[PDB]
Amino acid sequence: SHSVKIYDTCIGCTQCVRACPTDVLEMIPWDGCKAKQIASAPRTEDCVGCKRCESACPTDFLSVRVYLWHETTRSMGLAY
Template identity: 35%
Template structure:
């Protein structure tokens, strides 16, 4: 998994709106972000970068192959 954990989420939804692959969702009951589709994470770091409270921890264990256009 690329996103290891979300601790201290305030439920602002910024990570959900910045994620280009729809990995994160707001939990309807708690109102806080949760990792819904971890296999789709592209390790772009946008959710971590834009989180106002630094609640998201990302591991660099998954790498994205370089795209080469010929």
């Protein structure tokens, strides 16, 4: 649906996952930062697009990055 691609500038603070209201993101093991973890995005099909993940990303610009794309009923926040 959407396209939540993340970048290697992630520091493993786990704040995008802790902000995500749809479990799009999840921390995985990684070796590119002091915290030794990075935030994957398997459940991109559940992404509404609220960009709470990148309103909580403490990088110079951003590491998690939501690119709005084809809108499905899960991505249009529809309970009907």
